[PDB]
Short mmCIF file of C-alpha atoms in Angstrom, two decimals:
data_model
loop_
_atom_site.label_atom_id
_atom_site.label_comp_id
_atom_site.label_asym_id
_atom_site.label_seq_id
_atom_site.Cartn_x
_atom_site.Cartn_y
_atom_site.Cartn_z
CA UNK A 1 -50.76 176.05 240.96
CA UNK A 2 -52.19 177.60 244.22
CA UNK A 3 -52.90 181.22 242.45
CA UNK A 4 -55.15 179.68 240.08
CA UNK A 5 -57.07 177.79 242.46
CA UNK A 6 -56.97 181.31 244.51
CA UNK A 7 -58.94 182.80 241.62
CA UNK A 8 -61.14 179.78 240.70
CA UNK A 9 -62.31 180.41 244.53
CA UNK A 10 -62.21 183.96 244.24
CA UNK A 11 -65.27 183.30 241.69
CA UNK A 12 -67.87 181.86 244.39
CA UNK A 13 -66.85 183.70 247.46
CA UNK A 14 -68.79 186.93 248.42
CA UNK A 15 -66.24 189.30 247.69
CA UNK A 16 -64.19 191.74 250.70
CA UNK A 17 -63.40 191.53 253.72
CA UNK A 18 -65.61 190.42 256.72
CA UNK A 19 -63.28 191.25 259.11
CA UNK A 20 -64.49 194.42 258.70
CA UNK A 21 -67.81 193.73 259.71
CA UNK A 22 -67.37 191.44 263.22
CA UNK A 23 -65.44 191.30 266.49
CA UNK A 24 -64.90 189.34 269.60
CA UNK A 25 -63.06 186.48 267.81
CA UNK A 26 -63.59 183.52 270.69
CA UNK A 27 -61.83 180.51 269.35
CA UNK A 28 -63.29 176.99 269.88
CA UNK A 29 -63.08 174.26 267.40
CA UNK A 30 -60.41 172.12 265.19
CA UNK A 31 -62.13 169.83 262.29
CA UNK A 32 -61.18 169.89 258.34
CA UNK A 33 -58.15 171.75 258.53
CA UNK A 34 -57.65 175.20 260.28
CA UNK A 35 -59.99 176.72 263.07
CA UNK A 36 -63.71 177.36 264.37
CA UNK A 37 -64.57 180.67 265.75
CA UNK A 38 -66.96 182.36 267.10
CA UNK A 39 -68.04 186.21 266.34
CA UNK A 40 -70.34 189.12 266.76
CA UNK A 41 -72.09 190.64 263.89
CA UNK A 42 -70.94 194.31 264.57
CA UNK A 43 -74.26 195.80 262.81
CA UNK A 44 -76.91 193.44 264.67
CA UNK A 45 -75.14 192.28 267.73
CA UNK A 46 -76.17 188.76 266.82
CA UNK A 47 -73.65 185.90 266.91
CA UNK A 48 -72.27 183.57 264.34
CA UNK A 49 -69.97 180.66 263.89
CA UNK A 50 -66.88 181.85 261.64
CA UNK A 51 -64.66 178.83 259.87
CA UNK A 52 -60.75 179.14 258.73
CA UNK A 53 -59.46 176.91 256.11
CA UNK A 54 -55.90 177.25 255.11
CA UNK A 55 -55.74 177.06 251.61
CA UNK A 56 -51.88 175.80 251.97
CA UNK A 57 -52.70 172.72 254.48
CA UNK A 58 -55.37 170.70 252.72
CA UNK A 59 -55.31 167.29 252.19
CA UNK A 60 -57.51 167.86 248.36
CA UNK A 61 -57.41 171.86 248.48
CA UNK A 62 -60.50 171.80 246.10
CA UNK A 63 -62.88 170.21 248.29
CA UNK A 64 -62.92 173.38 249.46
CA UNK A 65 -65.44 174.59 246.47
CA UNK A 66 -67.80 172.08 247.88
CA UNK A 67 -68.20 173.88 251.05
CA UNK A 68 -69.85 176.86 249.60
CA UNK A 69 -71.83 174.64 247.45
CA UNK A 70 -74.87 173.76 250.18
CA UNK A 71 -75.20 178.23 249.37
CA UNK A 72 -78.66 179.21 250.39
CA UNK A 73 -79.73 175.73 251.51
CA UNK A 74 -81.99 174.93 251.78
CA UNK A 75 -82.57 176.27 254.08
CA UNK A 76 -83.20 173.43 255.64
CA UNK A 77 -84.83 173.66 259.30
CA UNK A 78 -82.50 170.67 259.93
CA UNK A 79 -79.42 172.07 258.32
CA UNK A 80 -76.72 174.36 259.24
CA UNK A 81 -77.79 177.53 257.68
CA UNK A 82 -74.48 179.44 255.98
CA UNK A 83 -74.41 183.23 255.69
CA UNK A 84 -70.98 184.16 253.63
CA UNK A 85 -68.63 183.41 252.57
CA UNK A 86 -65.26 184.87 251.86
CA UNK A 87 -61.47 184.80 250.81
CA UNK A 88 -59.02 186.27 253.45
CA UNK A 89 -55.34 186.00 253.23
CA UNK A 90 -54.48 182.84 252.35
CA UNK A 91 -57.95 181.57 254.03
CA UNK A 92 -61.34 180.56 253.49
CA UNK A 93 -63.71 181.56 255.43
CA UNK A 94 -67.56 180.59 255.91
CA UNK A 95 -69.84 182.28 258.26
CA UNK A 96 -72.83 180.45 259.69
CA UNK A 97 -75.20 180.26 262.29
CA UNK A 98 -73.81 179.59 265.72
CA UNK A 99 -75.27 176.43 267.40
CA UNK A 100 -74.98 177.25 270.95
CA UNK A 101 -75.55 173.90 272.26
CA UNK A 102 -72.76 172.15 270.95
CA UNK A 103 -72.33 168.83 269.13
CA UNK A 104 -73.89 166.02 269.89
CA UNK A 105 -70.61 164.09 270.17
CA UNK A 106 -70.08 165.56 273.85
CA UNK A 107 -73.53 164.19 274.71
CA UNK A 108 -72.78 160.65 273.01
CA UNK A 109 -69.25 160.47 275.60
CA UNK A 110 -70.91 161.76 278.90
CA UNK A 111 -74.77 160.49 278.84
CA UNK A 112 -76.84 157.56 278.16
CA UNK A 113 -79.27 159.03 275.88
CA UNK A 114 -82.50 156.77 276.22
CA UNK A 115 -84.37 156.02 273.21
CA UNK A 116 -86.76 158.44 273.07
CA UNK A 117 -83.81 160.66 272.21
CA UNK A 118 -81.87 158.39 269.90
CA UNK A 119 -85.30 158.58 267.53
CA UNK A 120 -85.31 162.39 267.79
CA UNK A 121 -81.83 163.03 267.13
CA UNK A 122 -82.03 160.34 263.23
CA UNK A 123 -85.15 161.77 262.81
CA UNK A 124 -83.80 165.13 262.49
CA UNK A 125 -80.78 163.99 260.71
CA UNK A 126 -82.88 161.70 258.85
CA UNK A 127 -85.56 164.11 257.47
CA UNK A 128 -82.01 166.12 256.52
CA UNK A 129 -80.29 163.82 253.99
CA UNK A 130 -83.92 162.64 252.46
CA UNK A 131 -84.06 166.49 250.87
CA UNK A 132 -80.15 165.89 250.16
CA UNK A 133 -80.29 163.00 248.48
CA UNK A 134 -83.45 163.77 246.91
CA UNK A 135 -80.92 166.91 245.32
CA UNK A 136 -78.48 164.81 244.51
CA UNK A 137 -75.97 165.54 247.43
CA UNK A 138 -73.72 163.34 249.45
CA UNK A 139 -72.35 163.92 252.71
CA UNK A 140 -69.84 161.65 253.44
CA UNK A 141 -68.75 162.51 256.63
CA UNK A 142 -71.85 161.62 259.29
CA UNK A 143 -70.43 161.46 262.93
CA UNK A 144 -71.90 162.75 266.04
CA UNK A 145 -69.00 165.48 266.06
CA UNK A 146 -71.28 166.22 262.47
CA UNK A 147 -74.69 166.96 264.85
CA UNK A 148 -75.12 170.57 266.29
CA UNK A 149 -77.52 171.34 268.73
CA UNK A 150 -79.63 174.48 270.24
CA UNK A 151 -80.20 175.40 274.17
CA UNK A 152 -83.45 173.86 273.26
CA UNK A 153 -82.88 170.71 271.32
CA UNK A 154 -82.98 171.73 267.90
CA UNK A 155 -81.30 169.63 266.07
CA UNK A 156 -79.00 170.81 262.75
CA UNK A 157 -76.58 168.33 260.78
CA UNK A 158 -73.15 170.54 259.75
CA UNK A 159 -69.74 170.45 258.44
CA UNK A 160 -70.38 170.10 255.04
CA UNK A 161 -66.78 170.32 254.14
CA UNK A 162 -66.66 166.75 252.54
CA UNK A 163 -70.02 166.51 250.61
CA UNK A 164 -70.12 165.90 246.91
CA UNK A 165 -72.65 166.73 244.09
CA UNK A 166 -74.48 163.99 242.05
CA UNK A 167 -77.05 163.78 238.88
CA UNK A 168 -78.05 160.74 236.52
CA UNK A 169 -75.14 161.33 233.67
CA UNK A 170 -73.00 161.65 237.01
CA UNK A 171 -74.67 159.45 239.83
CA UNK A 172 -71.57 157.88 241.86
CA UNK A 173 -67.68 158.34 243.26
CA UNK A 174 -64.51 156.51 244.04
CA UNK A 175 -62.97 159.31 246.32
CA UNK A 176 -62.04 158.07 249.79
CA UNK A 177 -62.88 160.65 251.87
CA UNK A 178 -64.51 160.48 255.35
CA UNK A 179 -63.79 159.70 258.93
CA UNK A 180 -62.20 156.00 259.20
CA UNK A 181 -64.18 154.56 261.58
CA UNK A 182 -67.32 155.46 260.08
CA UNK A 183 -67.01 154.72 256.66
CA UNK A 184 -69.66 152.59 254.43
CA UNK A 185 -68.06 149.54 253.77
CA UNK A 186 -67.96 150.12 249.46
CA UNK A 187 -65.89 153.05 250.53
CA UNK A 188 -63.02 151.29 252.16
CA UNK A 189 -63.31 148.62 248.82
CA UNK A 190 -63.51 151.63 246.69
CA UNK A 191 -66.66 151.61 244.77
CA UNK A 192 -69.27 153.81 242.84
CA UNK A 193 -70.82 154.33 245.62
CA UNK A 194 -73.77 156.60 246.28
CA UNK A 195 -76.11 158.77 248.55
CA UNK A 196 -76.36 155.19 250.81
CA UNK A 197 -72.86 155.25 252.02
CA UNK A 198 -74.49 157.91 255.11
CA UNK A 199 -77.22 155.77 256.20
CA UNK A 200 -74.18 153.47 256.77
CA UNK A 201 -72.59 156.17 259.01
CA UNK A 202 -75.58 156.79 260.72
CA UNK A 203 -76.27 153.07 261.79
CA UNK A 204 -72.32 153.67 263.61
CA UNK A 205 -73.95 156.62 264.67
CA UNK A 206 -76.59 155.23 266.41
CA UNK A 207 -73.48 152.58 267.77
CA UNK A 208 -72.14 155.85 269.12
CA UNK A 209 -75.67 156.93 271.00
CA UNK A 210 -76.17 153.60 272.40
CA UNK A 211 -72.53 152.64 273.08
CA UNK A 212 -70.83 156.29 273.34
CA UNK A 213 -68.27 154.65 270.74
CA UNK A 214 -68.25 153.49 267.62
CA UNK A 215 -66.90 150.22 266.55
CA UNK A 216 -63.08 148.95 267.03
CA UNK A 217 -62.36 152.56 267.96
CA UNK A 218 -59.26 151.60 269.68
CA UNK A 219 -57.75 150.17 267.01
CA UNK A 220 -55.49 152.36 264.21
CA UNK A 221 -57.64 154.11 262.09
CA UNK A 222 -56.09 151.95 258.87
CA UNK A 223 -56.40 148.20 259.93
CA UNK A 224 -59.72 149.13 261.44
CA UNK A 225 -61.06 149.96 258.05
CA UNK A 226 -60.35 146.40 257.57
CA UNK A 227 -62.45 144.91 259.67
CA UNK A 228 -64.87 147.12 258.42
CA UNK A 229 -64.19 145.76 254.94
CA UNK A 230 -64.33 142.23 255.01
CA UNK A 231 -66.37 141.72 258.48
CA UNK A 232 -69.61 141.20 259.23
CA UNK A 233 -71.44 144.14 260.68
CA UNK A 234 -70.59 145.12 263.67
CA UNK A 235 -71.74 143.93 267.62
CA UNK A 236 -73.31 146.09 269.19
CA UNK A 237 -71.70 146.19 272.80
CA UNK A 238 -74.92 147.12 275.06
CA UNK A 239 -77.53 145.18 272.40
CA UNK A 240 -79.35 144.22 275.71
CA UNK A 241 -79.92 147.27 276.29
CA UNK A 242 -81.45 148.28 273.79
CA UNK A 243 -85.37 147.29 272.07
CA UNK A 244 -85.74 145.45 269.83
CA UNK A 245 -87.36 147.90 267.71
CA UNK A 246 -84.34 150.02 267.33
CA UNK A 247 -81.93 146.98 266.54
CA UNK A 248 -84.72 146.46 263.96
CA UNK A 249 -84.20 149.62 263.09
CA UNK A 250 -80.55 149.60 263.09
CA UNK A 251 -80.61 146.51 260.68
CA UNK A 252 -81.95 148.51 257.71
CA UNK A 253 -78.93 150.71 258.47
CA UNK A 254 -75.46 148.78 258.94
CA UNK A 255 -76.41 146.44 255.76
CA UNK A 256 -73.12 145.22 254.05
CA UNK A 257 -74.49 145.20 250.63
CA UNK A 258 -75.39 148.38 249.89
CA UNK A 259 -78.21 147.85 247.42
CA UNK A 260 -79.83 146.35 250.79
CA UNK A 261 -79.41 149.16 252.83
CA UNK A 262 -81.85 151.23 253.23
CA UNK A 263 -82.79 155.19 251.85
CA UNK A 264 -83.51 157.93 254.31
CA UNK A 265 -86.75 158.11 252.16
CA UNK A 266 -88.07 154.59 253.47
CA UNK A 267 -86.36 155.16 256.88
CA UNK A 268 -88.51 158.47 258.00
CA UNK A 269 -91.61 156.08 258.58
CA UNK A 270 -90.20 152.92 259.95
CA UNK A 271 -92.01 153.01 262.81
CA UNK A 272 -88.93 153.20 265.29
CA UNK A 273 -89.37 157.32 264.74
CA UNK A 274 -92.99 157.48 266.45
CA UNK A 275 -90.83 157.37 269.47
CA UNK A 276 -88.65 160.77 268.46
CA UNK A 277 -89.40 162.85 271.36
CA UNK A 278 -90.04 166.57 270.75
CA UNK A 279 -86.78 169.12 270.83
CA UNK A 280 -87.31 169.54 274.72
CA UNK A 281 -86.63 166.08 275.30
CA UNK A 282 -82.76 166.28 274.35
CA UNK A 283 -82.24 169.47 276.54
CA UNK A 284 -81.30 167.78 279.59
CA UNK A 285 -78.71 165.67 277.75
CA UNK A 286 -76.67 169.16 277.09
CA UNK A 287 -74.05 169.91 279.68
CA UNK A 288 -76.10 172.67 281.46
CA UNK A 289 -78.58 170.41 282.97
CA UNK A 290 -76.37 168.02 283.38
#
């Protein structure tokens, strides 16, 4: 029933009506399902990033609790900090900061980011899901179209739409949820997996910095999964280009037994990361500058 789960969201939205409170409605985005906007605080004059979920077109409507869940977090300097959130119409919507430099994901497609800047940008996201999966939470949907950026480098993992919640009398899931072509390989094979199943997505990640795609991305999303099933990890195209310190790096990452694969917590001091440049490094990668 859709009024139930209505009410059931009712109970951990803010309550009203922020339509009430902003203006200038500037749309720009199209990820989970239903729209990314952009609007101006009416009281302050100050800018955020407003997020419309039709409760109607959802491919597991109640995914949509998790959402709400990363409330208050952490706040995390690396994070995506939320504001509100609400229930209007037949909508959800969450308010959060407004990352004016855009995703990272642009950046991957256009530039050749050198390493310097591949470092900074896992660092950030790295010293992110450590805290996360030191709390228990998932994320299970890492992608540079996942990596938000400041006119000044600052980098802020997002869309938290697909995370999940885990303790030790509940430590793994089965769900299959995530982008194809990024998905950790016990995911595909449907397995209790865990907190791991990002570094995974972070090693295609890194495919996508070095690269600017990630692997078999031509292929249909479904027989792609696959080869990402049974293969063995995947080539990096430009590997000459690249040191071998970060395809050392790299190889802790895109592990095929997960149990292998390294944590975020051992990853933040592998000494690949002495090279993360600081935030002012990454600025000329954003469109602007070029």
């Amino acid at each position: 029933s859709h009024e139930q789960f209505r009410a059931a969201l009712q109970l951990v939205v803010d309550p009203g009506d922020p339509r009430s409170y902003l203006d200038n409605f500037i749309k720009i985005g199209e990820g989970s399902t239903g729209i990314v906007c952009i609007a101006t605080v009416r009281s302050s004059g100050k800018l955020v990033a407003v997020k419309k979920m039709d409760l109607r077109k959802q491919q597991r409507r109640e995914l949509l609790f998790n959402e709400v869940v990363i409330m208050r977090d952490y706040q995390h300097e690396n994070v995506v900090e939320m504001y509100n959130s609400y229930l209007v119409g037949d909508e959800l919507w969450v308010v959060m900061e407004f990352l004016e430099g855009g995703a990272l994901t642009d950046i991957v497609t256009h530039t050749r980011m050198n390493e310097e800047q591949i470092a900074a940008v896992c660092l950030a996201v790295l010293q992110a899901l450590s805290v996360l999966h030191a709390q228990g939470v998932i994320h299970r949907d890492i992608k540079s179209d996942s990596i938000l950026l400041t006119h000044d480098g600052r980098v802020k993992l997002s869309d938290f739409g697909f995370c999940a919640q885990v303790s030790k009398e509940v430590p793994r899931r089965k769900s299959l949820v995530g982008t194809p072509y990024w998905m950790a390989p016990e995911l595909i094979s449907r397995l209790p997996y865990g907190p791991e199943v990002d570094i995974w997505s972070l090693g295609i990640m890194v495919i996508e910095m070095v690269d600017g795609e990630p692997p078999y991305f031509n292929e249909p999303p479904l027989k792609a999964m696959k080869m990402i099933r049974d293969n063995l990890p995947p080539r990096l195209k430009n590997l000459h280009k690249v040191s071998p310190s970060l395809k050392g790096f790299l190889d802790r990452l895109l592990v095929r037994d997960p149990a292998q694969r390294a944590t975020a917590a051992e990853l933040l001091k592998h000494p690949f990361l002495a090279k993360a440049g600081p935030p002012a490094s990454i600025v000329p990668l954003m469109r602007q500058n070029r």
